[PDB]
Structure formats: structure tokens, C-alpha cells
Amino acid sequence: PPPDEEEQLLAKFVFGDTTDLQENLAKFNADFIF
């Protein structure tokens, strides 16, 4: 079965995952900020 959300948050800290950050970087749209 898939892990729970709190497990996913816990997994991110231990394994130092940066994919979630990288997705935000790709979604970064300069127009939205300005």
C-alpha cells in the first residue's frame, strides 16, 4: 500500500529529497511573482 502523507514528509527529511523543490522551480512563472 502507498505511504501516508506524514510518512512522505518524514521520508523527505531523512532522504533529503529535492524533487518537490525542483517541481516548484519548474512551475516558477516570473509573471506571477511580479
Next chain:
Amino acid sequence: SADKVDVMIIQAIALLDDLDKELNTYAMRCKEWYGWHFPELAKIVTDSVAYARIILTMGIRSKASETDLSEILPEEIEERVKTAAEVSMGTEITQTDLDNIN
């Protein structure tokens, strides 16, 4: 016009220098004289006015524990004089002696 005489300005500046000297002289006398009771205040507080005000607020080292020196000295300095007070080197003085140094 009484408000356009230059002789006062030469007068005041000479007096101003004279006041600096005499105030300085009395200051050292307060340092050594009160230094007998509590010699290490001079090293901590160098300003003459702050030195004198501390004597006025507290006459004796025993008063150091309860007296507050916030208005005269900052926090780090006021605590340093308090710690010095208990471990101080000086001898006790009489109230007659305290009255005059005040």
C-alpha cells in the same frame, strides 16, 4: 547692545577650560578617596560624572546588592560593579566619612 560684546566670548572660553581642569582635579580626588573604600570602580567606570553618581546612589558596597545603577550605567557595566562589590578590596568607612565624600 549688551548682546554684541565679544569680551564675554573670550571670557567664557577661558572659564570653560578652567572648569574642565578643576572638575578633573576634584574627580581624581574622588577616585582615590572613595577608591580606599572600593578601589576598582575607577577601572570599570572611567567617566567622572558617572563615577560620582554611583557614590550618590550607593554610599557603601553593601548597598550594591539592592541598589540599581541602570540610569547611570548600562547592564553589563552595572553588574560588573556589583560583582566587584562583594569581592572588593577596600575597607569599611564611617558614616561621617560617607557624608563628606557624598
Next chain:
Amino acid sequence: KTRYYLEQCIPEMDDLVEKGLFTKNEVSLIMKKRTDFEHRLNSRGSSINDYIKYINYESNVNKLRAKRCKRILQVKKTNSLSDWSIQQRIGFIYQRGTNKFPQDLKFWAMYLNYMKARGNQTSYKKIHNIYNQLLKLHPTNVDIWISCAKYEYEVHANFKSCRNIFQNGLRFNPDVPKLWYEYVKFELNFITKLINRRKVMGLINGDIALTIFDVCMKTLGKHYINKHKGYYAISDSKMNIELNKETLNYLFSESLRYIKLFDEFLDLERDYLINHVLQFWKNDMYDLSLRKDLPELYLKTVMIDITLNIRYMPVEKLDIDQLQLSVKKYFAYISKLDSASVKSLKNEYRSYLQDNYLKKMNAEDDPRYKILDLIISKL
């Protein structure tokens, strides 16, 4: 010796792959995050924050393993090294951090709280060793002495050991009024639980504190005298009279605090306990008589005594007689007081009666409202 620490983690992790909770890649990530830290801990410039981060990081890894245990293995506990290794490891960081930086009392408290939470994992004997060590390093910190005393009286309820903590603490810190204040609090807390148990025992079928209070004064006075003189005695007679005064004013304050403390405890005879404090101040101390030198303290002493017999009855149970006893006390003290003190005592006694009884009274229903008003008009 970082490699020795790393090799100690190998058996735990060989278990984790064996149980299938963590894959060799996720395994690899955990070791890299660990390996950076032991080098940080073993390197020059290591700070206590570094140890906290490992304890936090290692704490998280325990949470992940527990969840994956139920998610994948579908077991509460898998009987293998992985279950207790992380808790065992987290402790090992605590001793090293405490040993490396004994000063930081915050880290010590995290150490005690962490293992206190896992009482089953960590025996109470392991608590005492650290407290023995910690108390040994900081005998002068009163907060610690109360910490272990409080712990063993609540979780363990060992009054004997708890009593010894105060006895040894007061031995090291007899000049701290707080430790005496707490030790008297524990002494009465023991008594109230004892009598309450006696009441429960009947249903299913204290002076000792005053001695602490009395001795509490004598040490605090001596220490307060020792301070404000420094190394030497004070030659001037007048200043010595002052040093006596600041003590009496100082000592008067702790006696007043204990008077507040007694009010908390309903079971004990507060009037009897308070009266002992009153009888204490009637005795002349340090060649000074309260009546002559410090009238203001004596007035507060009188105000308690006059209201002592009327202090603790509710408005409903106020009997007229004890009120008459109170006013007779008040008149007796007037004859021995100067005019200035009498007016101040008159105002305080009048305010006390008005606030405590009259303002809480119905003027139309209770006849004793009229007696109270007449007394105050006459006061």
C-alpha cells in the same frame, strides 16, 4: 575514530535491508547523512547544536521505521536489532554531548525528558545516575535539586528519597530561600496526602514544617548577614544596626511568604501554624524589638493576629462570638499603640471587615449585617 562509530551502524542497517523496510539506496542515503554528522561531532569547533540535530535526525529515522514496520511488515514489533538500535544510538549521543559540554543545562534537560518519556526502555536507575552526575556537576543550581525531588515524589512517590534530596540540597545551598520554600511545600504535601489517606481509610472501614520554617530563618539570616559585610565585620555601630534591620526586613518577607503558603492547605490547622509564626516574631531577635524600631512590621503582625480567629470561616458560618473575640483583641492592641499606628490599624481592620464580610452580605435578610455595621461605625 569516526569509522568506529560508522561500523557500529552496520549491523542495524543490515537488519533494515533484511526486513525489507529500507532499500539499499535509501539505506545509502541514511549513512551519508549520518557520516557527515560524526565528522561534525568529532571535528574541532563542534557545538552542542550539532548533537541536537543528530538527536532530531535520528529521532525522525525511528518514526520512518515504525511506520514502514506497520505499512510493509504489518507488524507492531519485528524481533530484530532494528527495534532498539535507534533508541540505543540516540542515548549514546546524549552522554557524549553532555560529557563534551557539561555547562549547557538545556541539553541535560532534553536528555532527562527524552529518557523519562521512554520509562520502559530506560530504567529509573538510569535516571538517578544522570541526576547524580548532573547534581554533582552543579550542586549550586537549586532548580536541579527540586527537579529530582519532584520527579521521585510524583512518578515514584518515594518520600524518603525525595526527603533526602532536600536535606542534601539545603546542605549545599542553605542561603537560597526558594529551596526552603519548596522543602516546606513537600513536607506539607506529604502530610496532606497522609491525612487524606487516613480519611479514605476511615471511609472504607504540621509541626515538622514549622521546624523547617524556624531553621529556615536562622540560616537565611546568617547568610544575609554574611553578605553585605563581605570578608570583614562592620565597625560602625549604626551600620551594624542597619545590617540587623535589612535582615529583619528581609527575614520578615520570607515569614510572610510562608504565611501565604499555609493558606493553600485547608486540611492543616492554619490558625495554629500561623500563630506559631506570630509567636516567633514576638520574641526579640538580634537585640531588636519589633514594637519600638519597626512599627510597620509590628502592625502587620498585629493585623494577622486580630484577624487570625476570623480569617477562615465563610460568610455563612461567621459566629458573633469569634467576631467579639477579634474586636476585643483589636481594642487591647490600641491601648499599647501610638496614635499614628492606631489610625493605620483602624483603617486596615475596617477595610478587612468591609471587604470580607459586609460586601458579601444581604443587608435586608441577615441580622448580623447590622451588628457588623455598628461595630465598624464604632471602630
Next chain:
Amino acid sequence: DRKRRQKLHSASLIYNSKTAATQDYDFIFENASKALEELSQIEPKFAIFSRTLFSESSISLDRNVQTKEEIKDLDNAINAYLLLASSKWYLAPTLHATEWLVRRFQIHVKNTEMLLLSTLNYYQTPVFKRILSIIKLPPLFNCLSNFVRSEKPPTALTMIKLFNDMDFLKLYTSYLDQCIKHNATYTNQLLFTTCCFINVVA
């Protein structure tokens, strides 16, 4: 090697080299995260970078290991932040917030034109001097090499020489064009460029 690391980590905008080497990324991030929150209160737009640039996961993000496409997205985000930080350099928290980008993403090495162009109007400000010390000047900014690690701040006369450089005008034009499209222009920026744009006959 270790020597390359100490040069990269020693560079700082808040602290000296010796203290900077001792510091860790997490301690820098903790201050920057607090700094960004203050910037968020002054302008809501700064809250946006909390999700991308000032995230906790950014502590584990290293630019060297990323691919080209990821870098371009990263550069664009750093580009946007410097524009919003352009008007707020006077405020202290911006310097703390920009420290994280300097320490983590090495903007002073890679996005050096973008950093310098943003703070060109603060040339007398001490922040600009600190920038010059920790930054390797591009070949357009060679006029400022004299004031690198110098007691004196760059003079107004030196701005005139650098500012009017045609291939820098086209550079500054695009930078000014970027501000206009994003409506990020402010009076000090308009005043500095205008005061130049009259002495930019030189």
C-alpha cells in the same frame, strides 16, 4: 579540494571570512528564513520564494549536480528575487535573506551581473562595497576593480564611465526593460539611471 571550499564558503555579506568559514548552511538558512518572513510582511511577494528558494529542502539542493534545464529554472527564480530585492537593499533583512543565496547558490560567482545591476544605485552604500570584495567583476564592470577591497566607495564620476558603455547600455537597457515589463521600477532606480542618463553622454 578544501582550499576551493574555504574560498567559496568564506564569501559573505553579513560576516567576516573567519567566522563565515566556521558557520554552517543551516545556521545561515535559519537567519535567512526569519529575514524572508520580515520581507514577506513588508511585501507579500517575498512569501513566494519561501516555497522555492528559502525552503528547508533547498538546504539539500546543490547546483553543481543539477542538469542544464534545472539550472535555467533556478537562475530565473534567482533573477526574480534580485528584482524585488532591488528596491529594499536599504532594509537590513534583505542582506540576511540574500546571504542564503550567496552561500547556497553562489549567485556572486554565477549570477554576478544580475546582482551588480540590481544594486548599481547603492554604489555609495556599504553593502555595495561588501559586494565588490566577494565578487569577481565581469569584463564590463572592470572600471570598478579599483574600488574592490578599497576604503573609498566608487565615485559618481566612475559610474559615468561604466554606465554609458554601449554594450553595457544594451545590457542595462534589457535590465531596465525587465523592470518595466514587471513594473518593478522605483524612484531611486529611475533617479539613478536618469541622473546617469544625462551624464551618460560620456
Next chain:
Amino acid sequence: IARVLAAKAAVSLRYDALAEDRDDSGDIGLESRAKVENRLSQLEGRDLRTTPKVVREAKKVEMT
């Protein structure tokens, strides 16, 4: 600045001393400062060290 300031000091002074109907405003002094302050600024702005220009070496270009 000492030479400049001393020169303006005499200007301000002699108006103070030799003026029959001087207004107690210091206006001659006020304008004198702006001259010295302007003199300080342009003197301050001067840079003794020569600026380095943008080096543009005509690097060799060889066909690929």
C-alpha cells in the same frame, strides 16, 4: 579644505565684525558653506588612481 575653509572664514568673519547693520541670521555664512561643501564634493569625487578600462583583446578566431 583647510585653505579653502580659512579663506571663507575670513569672508564670514569680516562681515560679522565690520557690518554696521548685520542681521543675526548667518546668511553669508550659510552660502559660504555650500561653496566649501561643493568644493569638498568635487575634490572628494576625484580619484587619484587611474581607472582600468574594459580590456578587449582581439582574440584569435580560427575557422572550424
Next chain:
Amino acid sequence: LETGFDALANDWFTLPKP
């Protein structure tokens, strides 16, 4: 009994030159 420790958890010798 109250304890704050748990709460705390969470030159002179140089002569003048001529």
C-alpha cells in the same frame, strides 16, 4: 513543587621615540 529546569528544556613599557 515547581522547577524551571524542565521548562528550560522546551605600550606600558615603551619609551617615547625622538
Next chain:
Amino acid sequence: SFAPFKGAAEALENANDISEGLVSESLKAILDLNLPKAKNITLAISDKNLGPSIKEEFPYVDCISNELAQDLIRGVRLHGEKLFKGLQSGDLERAQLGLGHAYSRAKVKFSVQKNDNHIIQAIALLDQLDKDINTFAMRVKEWYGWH
């Protein structure tokens, strides 16, 4: 362990009590807290005279003051505050200064009554006012002399 003294007065008492080789109330407390009851625990003390006093209070400790102990004692004084690992021990130099005069003036029975320095300052100040009262008063004459 480290048990700081409560204040100045207590230090002079223990500075004395150490002097003639006695065990103070504080020394009993610190030794009792630390030394295990226990065959016999060994304690290193610089002075042999204190040894019998320690033995009386604690029969379970045997004292050593041999050269091996002296060498270790010589180490502790050498590094001083450095061995406290940052524990608050003030500074050992200034504390020695206050204690030594207290330990010295106690034996000599020095008294402030003997102090005559107040005289030399009273005179040194008195003539100063006689000079300043004249100098300032002259200036008053000139200021009002114009008017």
C-alpha cells in the same frame, strides 16, 4: 564537581579552615556528595595535615599526598580555569587578590580606626577649595564688575 563559595565571608572561613588543616562544613558536603561509601576509596590531597581530619569525618577514604599526588595537584593549578571546561569559576587571579588581603588583614587585626589617609585627603582637598574659592570668586567680581 565544583562547588563555588556562597560569598566573600565564607571564603575567608574556609581559607582559614584549610590553613590549619580542618574540614569545613562545605568540604564535608562536597566530599560526601562525591566520594563513594565503598575497599577504601583513594583521595589525593596536597596537604598531609588535612588527611587525618578527612579520615575522621570519612572513615572509608584513605588520603594520599605522595609525590604522585603532588604532581597531579601541580597539573591542576597549572592550567587552572582551562580544566573547568567552561564551568563558571570566575577568574582565579582576582579572587586570590581579595582573599589574600582578607586572609592577611584578618590575622593582623587591621582596623579602619588606625586609618589616617582621610586626614591627608582632607588637607589636600581643603587647600584646593581655598584656591578655587578665590579663583572663582575673582571671576564673579569681574563679571559683575562690568555691570
